[PDB]
From Swiss-Prot, chain C:
Top-rank lineage group of the source organism: Eukaryota
Protein name, UniProt field: Dual E2 ubiquitin-conjugating enzyme/E3 ubiquitin-protein ligase BIRC6
Protein species of origin: Homo sapiens (Human)
Gene name as annotated: BIRC6
Family recorded in the similarity comment: Belongs to the BIRC6 family.
Function: Anti-apoptotic protein known as inhibitor of apoptosis (IAP) which can regulate cell death by controlling caspases and by acting as an E3 ubiquitin-protein ligase. Unlike most IAPs, does not contain a RING domain and it is not a RING-type E3 ligase. Instead acts as a dual E2/E3 enzyme that combines ubiquitin conjugating (E2) and ubiquitin ligase (E3) activities in a single polypeptide. Ubiquitination is mediated by a non-canonical E1 ubiquitin activating enzyme UBA6.
UniProtKB/Swiss-Prot annotation, chain E:
Domain notes: The BIR domain is essential for its anti-apoptotic function and is important for binding to DIABLO/SMAC and caspases.
Gene: BIRC6
Organism name: Homo sapiens (Human)
Tissue distribution of the protein: Expressed in brain cancer cells.
Residues of the full protein shown: 2565 to 2600 of 4857
Cited function: Anti-apoptotic protein known as inhibitor of apoptosis (IAP) which can regulate cell death by controlling caspases and by acting as an E3 ubiquitin-protein ligase. Unlike most IAPs, does not contain a RING domain and it is not a RING-type E3 ligase. Instead acts as a dual E2/E3 enzyme that combines ubiquitin conjugating (E2) and ubiquitin ligase (E3) activities in a single polypeptide. Ubiquitination is mediated by a non-canonical E1 ubiquitin activating enzyme UBA6.
Post-translational modification note: Ubiquitinated; mediated by RNF41 E3 ligase and leads to proteasomal degradation, impairing inhibition of apoptosis. Deubiquitinated by USP8/UBPY. Autoubiquitinated; mediated by E1 ubiquitin activating enzyme UBA6. Proteolytically cleaved. Acts as substrate for CASP3, CASP6, CASP7, CASP9 and HTRA2.
Signal peptide: none
Localization annotation: Golgi apparatus, trans-Golgi network membrane; Endosome; Cytoplasm, Cytoskeleton, Spindle pole; Cytoplasm, Cytoskeleton, Microtubule organizing center, Centrosome
Family as reported in the entry's similarity comment: Belongs to the BIRC6 family.
Name assigned to this protein: Dual E2 ubiquitin-conjugating enzyme/E3 ubiquitin-protein ligase BIRC6
Subunit structure, as described in the record: Homodimer; antiparallel. Interacts with RNF41. Interacts with DIABLO/SMAC, likely with higher affinity to SMAC dimer than SMAC monomer; this interaction blocks the substrate-binding site and inhibits the caspase inhibition activity of BIRC6. Interacts with KIF23/MKLP1, USP8/UBPY, BIRC5/survivin, MAP2K1/MEK1, RAB8A/RAB8, RAB11A/RAB11, PLK1, EXOC3/SEC6 and EXOC4/SEC8.
Amino acid sequence: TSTRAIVNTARSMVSTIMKFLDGIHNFAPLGTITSSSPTAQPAEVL
Amino acid sequence: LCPFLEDHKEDILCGPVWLASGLDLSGHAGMLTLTSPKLVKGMRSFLIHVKAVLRGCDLLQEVSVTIRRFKKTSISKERVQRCAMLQFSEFHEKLVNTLCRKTDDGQITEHAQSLVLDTLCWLAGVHSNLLSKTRKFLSDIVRVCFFEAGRSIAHKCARFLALCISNCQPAFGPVLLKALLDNMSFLPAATTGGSVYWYFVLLNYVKDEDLAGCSTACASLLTAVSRQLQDRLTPMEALLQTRYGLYSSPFDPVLFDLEMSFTSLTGLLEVEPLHFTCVSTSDGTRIERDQPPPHQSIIIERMHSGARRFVTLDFGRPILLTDVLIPTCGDLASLSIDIWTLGEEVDGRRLVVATDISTHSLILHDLIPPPVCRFMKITVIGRYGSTNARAKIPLGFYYGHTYILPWESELKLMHDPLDQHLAMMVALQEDIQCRYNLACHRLETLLQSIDLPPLNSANNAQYFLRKPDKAVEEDSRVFSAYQDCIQLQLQLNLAHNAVQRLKVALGASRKPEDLIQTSSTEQLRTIIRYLLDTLLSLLHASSVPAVLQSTFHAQACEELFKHLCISGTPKIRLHTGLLLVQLCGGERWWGQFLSNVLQELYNSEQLLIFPQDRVFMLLSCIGQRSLSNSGV
Amino acid sequence: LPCNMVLKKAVDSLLCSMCHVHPNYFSLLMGWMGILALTESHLATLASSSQSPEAIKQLLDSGLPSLLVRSLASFCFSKMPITADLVAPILRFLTEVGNSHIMKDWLGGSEVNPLWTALLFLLCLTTQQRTAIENATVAFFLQCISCHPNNQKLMAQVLCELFQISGFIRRLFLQLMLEDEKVTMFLQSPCPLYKGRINATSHVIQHPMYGAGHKFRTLHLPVSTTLSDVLDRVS
Amino acid sequence: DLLVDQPFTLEILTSLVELTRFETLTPRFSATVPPCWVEVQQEQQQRRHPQHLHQQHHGDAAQHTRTWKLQTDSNSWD
Amino acid sequence: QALDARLEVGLEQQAELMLKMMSTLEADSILQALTN
């Protein structure tokens, strides 16, 4: 029953294909940082 | 004619030459070689008349003039001899006959053909009846010069044909196209890759005439050759392509072409890598290393702006320099190359000056009068408006021969002067054969234990996602053995081509479907590359799409994809795919073709070994470029 | 099936096992191939299925190995038509059947030792054919003398006769004598041997007598390898 | 007598090629030009890439090459 | 682009320029075809 009721989260050939098509990672540098206060100093340096 | 020239009509020695005809690649520069048979038939003063039919000559910022005389030769009545070469038609016909090896039982030596080509090139330059002879023997001239001779002969014939094209006679372009197409079927038997390079350069330029004929010829040859290429793939080559992305044939000793980089040096198998030692340098600059010579670069501690520095390279002997390549260096504004054998101030020659060396790499390809220098001065001028303290300028690569032939060193056969080796080369070739066989055996034994799990289960997918340590070590060993095999294959092909040079100095000759059967795999791959590029340019220059539909239909397209895209090299795969999109992407069966290919190649019952990832990337690209076709 | 295909190797292992259970089946096998025009697939199947004592005995008593060796010797010095393309397949067939010690003794016997000199004379043909024949001959001699003192003596005699060093001969000497001899080690255990295995799919089609599963292992190790290293390769 | 009529051995072909070769005029020619064309010293033109070391064997442009820059006069376009 | 200066002496400089222009035109045509 449990085998029926779960899907394998282990990576499979779909992940392998994604890798073929090119511990945790900081994604803050890729983002854009804004503030609701119009007078705030730009926070991109953060 | 203009009023001045009408007044001086009888005094004309070189007919009016369009200024644009003298242009250089830069677009705003150039040179006219004012010459004619009348100039040769004579012996103190001249007039250069420049008339515009800012406006006209006002756009001519700067002009310069030089005069060059004929070399002083011991031959008696040399002026009468030159009159003789220029006048008599029998002379041109017999030159053509000897070039075509249709005289004296075809025992004309390659050096003899080279001299005949020199004479023909001089004649074509002087003139602009010889054109009639060239057109009548065009097929045979092309055959002998592009499919049975070396890179140098092919380049010289390419120059001769260029001069002929530049010339009330029938247009030479169509006739050259017909000759090239008639010889196309012999491409599998072409002797050297550098020769095929010039052949295809000429064919690509002259294809503008009779586009349909060139298209059908290229398509037929490509279809014929792709089957043979696919039939020659071995399971080991498939394994190397798939597991490692290595597409060379390490177990096939025969190469066909070597390049460095129609934008790269070609035909480098016929020449040797030239080693050199830094002997003198300007200021505290030096060279550092950052068979082929190690990559070397000039380190300059202080570059400044517009500052000249120089490095002197000693090859250790007078070397027949034939090819040079210097990587583009943005740190300098210009690069000058001078060459001298005895001394800089004794026999110094300016080899080249490159002013766009900052935005283009320096490429001297197959110097037709190859210098016989020994010492090489590279003078680099730092970039203007730049004060980068330290500069690292890649010296580049230099090729040629370390064994000058008696005629190559001959100082009387040049413009503006200032058997034991064969035995040794054959011994070296045999040594390299043995070493390369040992390396191939090593690679074979290592690959026979290499296994590629199919991508049909999660465990194999994880194997590919995280390559296990033992797999990593096996791949490292395979890469090392494969690199050894490729280096030894390159050395073996270079040694074979040097041995052929020596046997060609000595009287000797270099050599339909059986042709394709007997061609080497690398020769077939080079032919396929050139044919695919020709077809792509054909479509770009587009009735050529009207033809290529009798061929390259659903079945032909599928066969071509299977033969070239699955097993071909990355470039062959890419170009075949893009050609197929441009040709059949708008066809109704196109989407069915893509789905059928996907089914056949990626269904789990397929045992064919191929680079699934690369073929899938190709399929995605092809489908994206044909997504306007509703059927995809 | 095409030759060298792993599926064909597995089917041929099944044929080998069936012949080992029913030796007469091998005769039927030899009957179905005509034991003349033997294709490379015929040679592969026969070599694989003949890897049993009874099967190898019947193969020798059929006269096919003798006919092959005589035809190869006739080809080299120039009753079956032999072309340069069949030399490498026949040499590979002889190597594969020489996996057996009986065929290894036969290959070094008086009837076969002329073939060694014939091969060396022939090599010391198209370039691809020459390369294939050279590789096949190196493999054939490596199999014949592999841990075989008598065949080692025979090959030493042949090489001394040849010498009484470049090209094929230098490569042969380097590969055969200046490389460590490799022996096949067959390890059985009452418990599984898990070390050295990869979870991914791998088709190792060896002779069926080497078993299957985790309790059997087959290694190809230099004779210099210490037994401790052998054990470390499996535990 | 003439090389054209003789058989094309390596000697005859070499003679013909030697006939076809060229050299640069060791002494520079003199030139008279319209006023709008104004000469420039060859050392100036080759300042970026000097040939002074080659001057010994008449390789510099000062011995065989003349140069003029154009002044955009009224009839300079003509 | 960066011709060898020795082609100036003979009558083959224009021919070599035309050959290089041939090669460059073919390269540009191929690049444009690949980037449709």
